[PDB]
Amino acid sequence: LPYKVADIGLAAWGRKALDIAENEMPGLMRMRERYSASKPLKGARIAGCLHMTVETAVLIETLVTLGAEVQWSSCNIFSTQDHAAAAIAKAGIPVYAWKGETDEEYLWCIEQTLYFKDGPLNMILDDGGDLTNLIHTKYPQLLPGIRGISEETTTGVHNLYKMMANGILKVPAINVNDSVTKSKFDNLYGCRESLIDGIKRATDVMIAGKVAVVAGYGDVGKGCAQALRGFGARVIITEIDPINALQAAMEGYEVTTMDEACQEGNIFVTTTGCIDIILGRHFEQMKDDAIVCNIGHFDVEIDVKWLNENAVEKVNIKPQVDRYRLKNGRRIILLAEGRLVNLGCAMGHPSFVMSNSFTNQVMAQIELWTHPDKYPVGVHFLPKKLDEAVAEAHLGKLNVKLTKLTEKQAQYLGMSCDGPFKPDHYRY
Amino acid sequence: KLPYKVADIGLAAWGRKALDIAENEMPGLMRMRERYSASKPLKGARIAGCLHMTVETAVLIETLVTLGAEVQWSSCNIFSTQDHAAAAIAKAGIPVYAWKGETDEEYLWCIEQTLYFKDGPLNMILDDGGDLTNLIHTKYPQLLPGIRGISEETTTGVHNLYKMMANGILKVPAINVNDSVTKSKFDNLYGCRESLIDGIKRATDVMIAGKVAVVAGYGDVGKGCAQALRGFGARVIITEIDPINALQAAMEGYEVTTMDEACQEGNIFVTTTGCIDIILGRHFEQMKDDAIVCNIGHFDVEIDVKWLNENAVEKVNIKPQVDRYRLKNGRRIILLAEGRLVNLGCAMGHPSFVMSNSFTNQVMAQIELWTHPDKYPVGVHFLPKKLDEAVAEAHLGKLNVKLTKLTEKQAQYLGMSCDGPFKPDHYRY
Amino acid sequence: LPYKVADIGLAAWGRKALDIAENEMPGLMRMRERYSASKPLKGARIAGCLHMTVETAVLIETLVTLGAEVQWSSCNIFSTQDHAAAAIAKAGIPVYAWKGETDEEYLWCIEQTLYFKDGPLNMILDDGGDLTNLIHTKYPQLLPGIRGISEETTTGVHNLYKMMANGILKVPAINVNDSVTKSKFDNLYGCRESLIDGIKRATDVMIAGKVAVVAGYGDVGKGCAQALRGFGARVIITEIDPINALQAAMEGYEVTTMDEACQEGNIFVTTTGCIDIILGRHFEQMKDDAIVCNIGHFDVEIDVKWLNENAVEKVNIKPQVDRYRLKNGRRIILLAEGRLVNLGCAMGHPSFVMSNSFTNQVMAQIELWTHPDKYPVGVHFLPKKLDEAVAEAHLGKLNVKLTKLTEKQAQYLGMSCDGPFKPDHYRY
Amino acid sequence: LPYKVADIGLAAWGRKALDIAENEMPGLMRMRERYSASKPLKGARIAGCLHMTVETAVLIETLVTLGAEVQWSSCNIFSTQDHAAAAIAKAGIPVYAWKGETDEEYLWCIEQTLYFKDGPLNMILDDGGDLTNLIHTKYPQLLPGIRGISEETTTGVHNLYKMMANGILKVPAINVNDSVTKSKFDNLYGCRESLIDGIKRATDVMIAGKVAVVAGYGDVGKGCAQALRGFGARVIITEIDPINALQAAMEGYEVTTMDEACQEGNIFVTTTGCIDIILGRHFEQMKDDAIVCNIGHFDVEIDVKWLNENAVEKVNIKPQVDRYRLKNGRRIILLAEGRLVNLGCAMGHPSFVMSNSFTNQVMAQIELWTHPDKYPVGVHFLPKKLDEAVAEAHLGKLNVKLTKLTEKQAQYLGMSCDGPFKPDHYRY
Ligand SMILES: NC(=O)c1ccc[n+]([C@@H]2O[C@H](COP(=O)([O-])OP(=O)(O)OC[C@H]3O[C@@H](n4cnc5c(N)ncnc54)[C@H](O)[C@@H]3O)[C@@H](O)[C@H]2O)c1
Ligand SMILES: NC(=O)c1ccc[n+]([C@@H]2O[C@H](COP(=O)([O-])OP(=O)(O)OC[C@H]3O[C@@H](n4cnc5c(N)ncnc54)[C@H](O)[C@@H]3O)[C@@H](O)[C@H]2O)c1
Ligand SMILES: NC(=O)c1ccc[n+]([C@@H]2O[C@H](COP(=O)([O-])OP(=O)(O)OC[C@H]3O[C@@H](n4cnc5c(N)ncnc54)[C@H](O)[C@@H]3O)[C@@H](O)[C@H]2O)c1
Ligand SMILES: NC(=O)c1ccc[n+]([C@@H]2O[C@H](COP(=O)([O-])OP(=O)(O)OC[C@H]3O[C@@H](n4cnc5c(N)ncnc54)[C@H](O)[C@@H]3O)[C@@H](O)[C@H]2O)c1
Ligand SMILES: O=C(Nc1ccc2nc(N3CCOCC3)sc2c1)c1ccc(CN2C(=O)C=NC2=O)cc1
Ligand SMILES: O=C(Nc1ccc2nc(N3CCOCC3)sc2c1)c1ccc(CN2C(=O)C=NC2=O)cc1
Ligand SMILES: O=C(Nc1ccc2nc(N3CCOCC3)sc2c1)c1ccc(CN2C(=O)C=NC2=O)cc1
Ligand SMILES: O=C(Nc1ccc2nc(N3CCOCC3)sc2c1)c1ccc(CN2C(=O)C=NC2=O)cc1
Fold it and tell me: Which parts of the sequence carry N6-(2-hydroxyisobutyryl)lysine (chain B)?
């Protein structure tokens, strides 16, 4: 089996989508402009485990343009876009991914990416840690032949630190999740674009003139709060961290508890990454047809089980939109069954966000592959200069003219005119 | 003869579900039910309505019925009906003649069925766009003495009403509700603010932040569009022919220049002028690759779509109402809704709460015309300010707004009534 | 007497401040550019009565440039800037004004302006209606030889409408006050600009993170609320008009009563134009060191008398800043003794704001004088095409490039390509 | 000599200002609430070198309230508010500082703080490193008796790493400058409040409708841009960092070069911390009466020397406001001679900002004095849990209600419910 896709005939529709996405992903296209001649990944045999979307197809074809051998599988059973996968298969690349895999087929799809034309993998590009854990626990014989790992997920990086503390990790790993360019686009800018899009497709509701309660004021909360405020909603924040709580107050947001705010809100958005945020006792105080949704962590934040078990009516309105009637006579509108509203009720992040994340991945691959004896086994942050480079790559598309330091200004500032321009502890 | 005519009356239960959701978002119409269902002030009325047969309009329809009126209904556009909403109205025993995908002949037919009731011909006209008003004057001028009032809510329709008075054709009193504060601001500003981006997003899924968005026009639509784009992190450039409107944009920090200049800078183009020849061939040729171009102003006149069709070397349809043209220079143009209204072509229009402000405006006008025959001679009138205010007050509860009441002493000082109106007719808000 | 000033040897300083203020008043300078050669006012003896400031000094010299004889007095006792007064006296213009006049001297100064070198006044330019009221009641002989009045005050136009209601107005007038370009700048943009300057100079207080309660959401309220919000304050609104209240809600502001909001606010700002807004029972509920000020109508909005009568301490911190201690042991910081904070604690509106108000005046003078057989004896709004021309005059300074309607476009729209562009009911 | 102040008779005025400041400095009043009974600084002989302002005077009396003996001097010759220094003098606290000191007097004043009644100092509270530099060079005898150093300045902290690298630092030190609660208030929020205050007092110019060029988009630039945008100015950013350039772009600011931007701007503000930002080449292109000022680094950013050397006129308008006429006949308005505009033309940061920086200082002292063993000789960041504590201390004043994690939630998140809540790399 050279690949496995749902329908190869969808390749043409995929290529048209790719062509449109390329123009919103200038960071990846910049890497093609810079590195297509020199091919810094010639020799590399990269196994990738990452959502097989249109955006990811741009990543895959960028890596190939840089000289690498690439074989791919999706890191989720439902997230694949079949036409994107088809387009990649038609271009010769071994890709094992389709929408609605079984749990057995998911494991099998990863298995087909380990050995290549010219022997086993020597690089891992990862999103969730599933490819990394499969090698270590099942195929540890292959570990010495692997030069490096890239990982861009919070779960995956926590897992990498765990493997290092337990002495299990045997390959140097670059964490790109904590890049400024990755984190700000994935957490803040991304959710700022897509939140209200999810709410609108689901409900078509008037945002302006409503009280909106956002639980959490981290990067995701900041983003959501800014989007809602922009439409003319009155935004109330809840926070546990007094620093984040202070930030909110300094922008003019009311900051209070969910115990208080549940009587106020017309819309509730959870962004905490934490369990037990919206509970039965909160639901019972809510205004009629209050909209409740999550954009934070999987499905743990809203007590959905409570609604199923305590409501008198549950009525499906349209896909991923349920309207529960309670014992008190009032209604709750739940979106995406408590799951991520931006993926359940909308299309997730825009292409431009994904460009920042995936450009970080490309940087990490080059850095590990081109500099073998520069990273010992262990989890490493992406160097700042490469993080800056990711940002630089996107400035052209953003109509931005960057100023260059003069030799004299550099000397005064005690930094190189090429970077990095900030110390490692700098918060931006 | 036919008691109603609609695509599929089996969709009525789905209709009722949508009505129930939207009723909560339409407190204006629902407060009308609260205070006038007892007294039934439209009793003995027989209202022929011509208005898009939607969920919102269904709530309008039933509010008219709740207040004692007899109602018969047709849509004012051939594609704008929601069949489930029309089914729900048909299941409730109301003569509705409407479906999505009508012929120009079926459209005319649908309106003709609403003129005669069992107890006699129409008493009142509720209109959007003038077509019901135009049919009775052209073709059924016998009925004109029987008709007590007209409500009209469209710019097109109000202009037409003023043209008919100038020539002495209009034989019925009419209330222009289009120029109400509560109507104009919701329909022009707040509505477009909410739905522009919904249109753009559903069509393209594009990142709005970090883009130059060129907004032609800074009227109320323009102001809303500009504000919406700005809030996403787009750099909004504006074009204007009116120095006051141009000055307003400058005072909010927007760059104001010409389309001749701005066509080189913009990633997104949005027309809001209500005027022809806004975006043109010479502009298209200057644009960046994959410049998203759309319209939220007047029907399809603002963008020269005919130019694109005649001059592009490729035209590929990406999805419904989204076309990607390739030009002779090898660069591409993404056009939304074929130059038609992007918020209605690529999304579902305005939210229920916007529509509530407009439709409560209609209900106010009807009661006023029916209850007070001697008060309005033949001609075009604005809705009185005190009724405009009542529309706004009817939505304050929903908005968690506690309104202050003037003390007797304060009202004497200010020289107004404590119940209003609170502003003179020239006041601009 | 040719003039009367405090010190005519302050004219160097005056001319310097004029030269600065001319650049920020392009509306008046555009009038000099268009009209200095044609002198449309040639034969106009204009008797003015308006605050004798650097700003107004520019207006005075623009009228002269446009070919008019002009004689001036101040419409207020304290508002005259003496260096500006000096400079106008030096250029051979009869100006009778200084800072700290008596009520008797005030009436005398205005009486001197009525009689020119060549006879009685041809025109009236007025702010507050005092010059208009003087000639009707005290000098009824001069009415037939005066072609028109320009008025730019809420006070003044109401008095003009009262005079016309009762039949004691024998000369036609232009109401400039309800021009878009006057109203927006004087009410909205000006107060947005100068409220916070007023508060800061008085207190130096942090705005961000405070609850700021703004009574009234008219043009002043909107200005004040937008400014406070921009600094990161949580703005609460009070209103009696449901339309205005709806507007505030649609921008995300909380809207509640003063009876409720007095327990919340760190800063109170009154803009209603109405009596009995902030009262003793509101003062008793306020947080410690609540700042209370007025930017609306004179001194009727806040019950300052109550504080004087009921406080246990009254300390002056600095000029126009009083700190009261109440029986409950809590403190109130009152700005400007309940007078206008922007004029009491700061310099009032910027020059650019004033340029829009006075260019409206200049237009009114040209319109009445150049068209005698057009305006019959009454109160009129400045024509829209002239309101438009005020705005146009400032666009150059704003770096604005105005589009011109092609003839084909103007036909479609059924208007002229020179205007007016909007109907008379249009609200902007 | 017990103290040396300009005039002790200004202490009733000072106490009055002190009483106002206290209510805006909840951080320091919360430290007085918690620790006034326990007396954690009991025994501590603190020598502080820091601007002798009303704000600092609260910090001083907070340290005394915590059971410390404190001797004080200013860290700048002009920054003392004499009336504040008199209040601290009358409270019986040895303070040696006045407005307008000589460089020999400045030194003298710091030398008077080293020696108390009971003996020599145990602790150093510092701003700019001049107390710390004096003792190591000129009083190394006192080094072993000194338990800890607090320091809150970029200059002062860069200096500790220069000392530590060369083995001369022989006292443990806490860097408080890079705390979240210090950095955000001193840099971003502070300048957001005070920039425009500076420009207004100097010029009274309309901000709305103008192009404003902000050089730099760091914390200072971010604040300055946000403030200008809030008034209705069109803001243009210049940047050398692609990440910060990207951040500006994502909020809809234009990002171009000064070489291009100099032809556009009505207002210019420099925030880079870098030399050669505004130059003669730029000045020659500027619009007539461009307002140019600096809020970044001292007087290096704007080539003020060029203006003095190449302009045909230089005219003082008022203190710290100079208006040059250039060879091309156009005018430039320089503010504060290119020095910090917020301190040159206004009062600097509000009391509430300063509360965050000086509460950091209190936290630093307790942590050093009560835990000597914990800190080896070196430069240490302030621990996060204390940074959090600073923020928590201000929430009460802000009307903020912080949520507390349940035991179950804390367990799920792998953190204590008392904190810290974020890892050390977290950027807020
Ligand atoms: N939906 C998406 O597409 C998407 C995108 C990026 C990240 N995320 C996820 O969203 C979550 C948040 O990400 P982030 O970057 O904002 O994290 P963050 O650490 O920046 O912010 C989370 C905030 O929630 C607060 N918090 C924790 N428990 C709380 C409680 N019980 N009540 C109130 N506040 C509480 C914390 O103080 C913290 O400030 C994560 O789980 C992340 O994986 C989702
Ligand atoms: N999409 C929708 O659902 C929807 C909703 C409401 C209104 N509208 C329509 O939108 C249009 C605009 O409505 P409005 O209330 O903002 O009108 P408006 O009069 O308030 O504003 C239109 C503006 O366009 C400007 N303009 C005209 N020609 C121009 C040109 N060639 N270049 C630049 N500017 C120009 C005018 O100066 C004016 O300020 C109307 O056709 C209206 O019917 C659409
Ligand atoms: N400070 C200045 O230099 C300056 C500048 C311009 C205007 N003004 C003055 O400020 C005042 C307001 O001007 P405006 O143009 O906003 O008038 P406006 O009529 O547009 O607005 C006043 C608002 O106050 C509301 N109001 C009245 N009584 C109220 C009450 N008891 N509680 C709450 N709201 C109440 C009204 O509903 C109205 O919307 C006027 O007196 C005007 O003369 C002052
Ligand atoms: N006036 C005040 O009260 C006050 C308060 C705090 C800090 N500061 C000072 O302000 C300055 C900046 O502080 P910060 O916290 O913003 O530092 P920062 O590092 O966060 O910001 C400085 C920014 O300027 C940019 N920059 C450097 N050289 C440049 C050039 N030639 N052109 C354009 N941009 C350039 C950098 O990319 C950087 O992002 C420092 O000198 C600091 O001491 C002043
Ligand atoms: O995880 C992702 N998508 C996902 C997974 C499961 C799922 N299950 C659903 N339902 C279906 C109806 O029945 C109930 C369960 S919807 C759904 C969506 C996912 C994450 C990041 C990117 C990254 N990304 C973008 O955001 C845009 N391009 C990208 O690559 C994609 C998908
Ligand atoms: O007009 C509406 N809708 C519409 C949709 C498609 C369409 N397609 C057309 N054709 C043209 C000829 O070529 C082919 C395509 S015309 C047309 C019209 C419409 C307006 C107001 C409200 C009012 N409204 C809201 O906005 C929300 N609820 C409402 O009732 C509805 C629909
Ligand atoms: O009315 C104006 N100024 C004014 C009047 C009286 C007054 N009384 C005071 N106190 C002092 C202490 O004892 C008690 C009385 S302070 C004060 C200030 C006034 C209005 C518009 C413009 C128009 N204007 C601007 O706003 C800017 N340039 C202008 O021309 C000016 C002043
Ligand atoms: O350095 C400070 N202020 C200062 C220094 C010198 C100076 N020189 C001037 N001119 C005068 C006319 O001739 C030319 C020289 S004005 C001026 C002002 C300084 C810093 C932080 C805080 C800390 N701070 C605040 O920011 C607010 N409260 C505070 O404690 C204070 C002052």
Answer: 183
What amino acid positions of D are annotated as catalytic residues? 51, 74, 79, 127, 152, 177, 182, 186-187, 191, 297, 349, 357, 361
Classify domain B1-189+350-401 by CATH architecture: 3-Layer(aba) Sandwich (3.40)
The one-letter code for the residue type at D193 is: E
Whether the domain at A1-188+349-400 and the domain at A189-348 fall into the same CATH topology? yes
- Which residues does chain A have within 8 Å of residue D241's beta carbon, measured at their own beta carbons? 388, 421-422
Residues near D359 by beta carbon (within 8 Å), at least 6 away in sequence: D25, D27, D28, D30, D31, D181, D390, D393, D394
Strand D331-335 relative to strand D321-325: parallel, antiparallel, unpaired? antiparallel
The DSSP letter of residue B187 is I
Order of all β-strands in the sheet with B322-326 = B255-256, B235-239, B212-216, B268-271, B291-295, B332-336, B322-326, B314-319
Q: Which ligand is nearest to the CA of B56?
A: 6
Chain B nearest-CA residue for A201? B198
Say if ligand 6 is within 6 A of residue B192 CB. no
If we measure between CA atoms, which residue out of C148, C17, C1 comes closest to residue C81? C17
Selection from D9, D88, D25, D8 nearest residue D51 by Cα: D88
- The ranges assigned to domains in chain C are 1-188+349-400, 189-348
3-class state of residue A3 by DSSP: coil
C416 lines ligand 2 (CB under 6 A): no
Q: Quick one: tokens of B232? A: 């996403």
Could you list the active site residues of B?
Answer: 52, 75, 80, 128, 153, 178, 183, 187-188, 192, 298, 350, 358, 362
Q: Indicate yes or no: CB of B193 within 8 angstroms of CB of A211.
A: no
Q: Is D220 annotated as a binding residue?
A: yes
Residues B263 and B287 sit within 8 Å (Cβ to Cβ): yes
Angle at C188 between CA C183 and CA C194, to 5 degrees: 125
Does the domain at residues A1-188+349-400 carry the CATH identifier 3.40.50.1480? yes
Q: Hey, what are B18's tokens? A: 């949508």
- Counting ligands in written order, the one closest to the CA of C158 is 3
Residue C418 CB coordination number (10 Å): 12
Q: How far is the CA of A297 from the centre of ligand 1 (A)?
A: 7
Distance from the alpha carbon of residue C78 to the mean position of ligand 7, in angstroms: 6
Q: D351 vs C323: CB contact, 8 Å cut-off? A: no
Q: Residue B142 has which token pair?
A: 């016998």
Superfamily of domain B190-349: NAD(P)-binding Rossmann-like Domain (3.40.50.720)
Task: Tell me how crowded residue D299 is: count the other CB atoms within 10 A of its CB.
Answer: 15
Q: How far apart are CA B232 and CA B252, in angstroms?
A: 16
**Mutation test of the interface with chain B: which of A83, A185, A193, choosing the one with the most B Cβ atoms within 10 A?**
A193
Q: Which of C79, C226, C320, C365 is catalytic?
A: C79
E strand or H helix that includes residue B176: strand B173-176
| Structure determination technique employed | X-ray
* DSSP-assigned states of every residue in B42-78: TTT-EEEEES---HHHHHHHHHHHHTT-EEEEE-SSS
User: What is the crossing angle of helices D130-138 and D154-165, to 10°?
Assistant: 30
Q: What class, spelled out in words, does domain C189-348 have in CATH?
A: alpha beta
Resolution in Å equals 2.7
